[PDB]
Every structure is written in structure tokens, then in C-alpha cells.
């Protein structure tokens, strides 16, 4: 029986939290139609049973039914890919780094309290790179079929959209039309709706880090 431990919403131990890494794992299981049990962990009050199988307190951790719990969403999604090959979510190596700097740039811009430090511009450069890629090879990162890269990137774009609009009133420019089509499509997938954090909980997660 497949099981995954993931972070709960801050202050709400029985509600899904907002880790994009955990969401990547949950999306992978959902899209592959793999039945799983989800255990929510209050990462500010971890239970001892959890500390025993995850001694460093890491989440997500995944139990594939083979008598062990493994961390790291990169690794976990590879294990799931190998165990449940169909639908294939393999992203070709040539596109594996598409969008790879968007999240770090987003977090730097979010936390910046200087409008002129170039953090916005850096983020825009990465979004424009995503735009050109989707333009030439969309609608997903690898064209017609959804793949791993999408399930890694979409959770991170969700954070970007929600947090930047809330805390800075900032939106991805409307002229990046392929990026907008991309986020509208990914965020409205059944799997995404099922596995995302309610926006107020994601905002609560970021609030102490913004100020
Ligand atoms: N300033 C850190 C925030 C703390 C952190 O370790 N991870 C982030 C990105 S997942 C986080 O937990 N943000 C609050 C949240 O996701 O609710 C960052 O930019 O990554
Ligand atoms: Ca919501």
C-alpha cells in the first residue's frame, strides 16, 4: 500500500498544506491513478511515529509498499515513474531544466523590499524564457502529453501567482499569453484542484517570511 507524508497547513493539522515538492508527488500519484494514503504532518508538532521513519523531519516522504520511507521529490517521482510506467511522465532530458530558475527568482522578488534591485527583472527574464519554450513546444513542457516537468513546475507557479498578487499586487504580464494559457490549464486540472493548498493557507505560510 502506497503512502505519503506531507506538510499540513500552518495552524490546521488536518488540512492540506502548501509544499510545492509534496504537491509534485501528490500530482504524480493522482495523474498516474495510483491509490494512496496521505498522512498530514504538522511540521511544528511532528508526531514521534513520523520522526522514527523520517529522523530529520523531512517531508514529503514516500512509502511505495517496499518497507521503507524515501525523501526528495526528485527521487520520489522517479521511483513512481519506474513502478507505474503508464501514463508515461518522462520528460526528455533536453527540456528538464525548462522553468528551472522561476521559483528561486520568485522567492527573491517576493522577499525583496527594494523595488529597484533587479529581482523583478530577473524573474521576468525566466518567465519570458518559459513563454518562448511553450510557444515553440507547447501546450505542455513536452508538447501534447503532460509529463514530470509540468508536475514539478505548476506547483511553483501557483505559489508565484498567489503570493505575488497578494503581497505585492504583481501579476505575470498579460503579454506572456502562452504562460497564462499554461497556468490556467494546469491549475484547473482535477489533480491540481485536489492537491493544492487553499490560497489563504499558502498566504499564511509565506507571511512570516515576507515580513
Ligand atoms: N525564504 C525561504 C522561505 C522558507 C523555505 O524554506 N521554503 C519556502 C518555499 S517552499 C517556504 O516554505 N515558503 C512558505 C510556504 O511555502 O508556505 C525561501 O525563499 O525559500
Ligand atoms: Ca483557494
From Swiss-Prot:
Subcellular location: Cytoplasm, Cytosol
Residues the record lists as binding glutathione: 7, 18, 46, 59, 73, 159, 206
Classification via SUPFAM superfamilies: GST C-terminal domain-like, Thioredoxin-like
Residue positions binding L-ascorbate: 7, 18, 209
PROSITE patterns according to UniProt: GST_CTER, GST_NTER
Subunit relationships: Monomer.
Name of the protein in question: Probable glutathione S-transferase DHAR1, cytosolic
Application of this enzyme or protein: Overexpression of DHAR1 improve ascorbate pool and redox homeostasis, and enhances grain yield and biomass in paddy field conditions.
Amino acid at each position: 500500500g502506497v503512502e505519503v507524508c506531507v506538510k499540513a497547513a500552518v495552524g490546521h493539522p488536518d488540512t492540506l498544506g502548501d509544499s510545492p515538492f509534496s504537491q509534485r508527488v501528490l500530482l504524480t500519484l493522482e495523474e498516474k491513478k495510483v491509490p494512496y494514503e496521505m498522512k498530514l504532518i504538522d511540521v511544528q508538532n511532528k508526531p514521534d511515529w513520523f520522526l522514527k521513519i523520517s529522523p530529520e523531519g523531512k517531508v514529503p516522504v514516500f512509502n511505495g509498499g517496499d518497507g521503507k520511507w524515501i525523501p526528495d521529490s526528485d527521487v520520489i517521482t522517479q521511483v513512481i515513474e519506474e513502478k507505474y510506467p503508464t501514463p508515461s511522465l518522462v520528460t526528455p532530458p533536453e527540456y528538464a531544466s525548462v522553468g528551472s530558475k522561476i521559483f528561486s527568482c520568485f522567492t527573491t522578488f517576493l522577499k525583496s523590499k527594494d523595488p529597484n534591485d533587479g529581482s523583478e527583472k530577473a524573474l521576468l527574464t525566466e518567465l519570458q524564457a518559459l513563454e518562448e519554450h511553450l510557444k515553440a513546444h507547447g501546450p505542455f513542457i513536452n508538447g501534447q502529453n503532460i509529463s514530470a516537468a509540468d508536475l514539478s513546475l505548476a506547483p511553483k507557479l501557483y505559489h508565484l501567482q498567489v503570493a505575488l498578487e497578494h503581497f505585492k499586487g504583481w501579476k505575470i504580464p498579460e503579454d506572456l499569453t502562452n504562460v497564462h494559457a499554461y497556468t490556467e490549464a494546469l491549475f484547473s486540472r482535477e489533480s491540481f484542484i485536489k492537491t493544492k493548498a487553499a490560497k489563504e493557507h499558502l498566504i499564511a505560510g509565506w507571511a512570516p517570511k515576507v515580513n
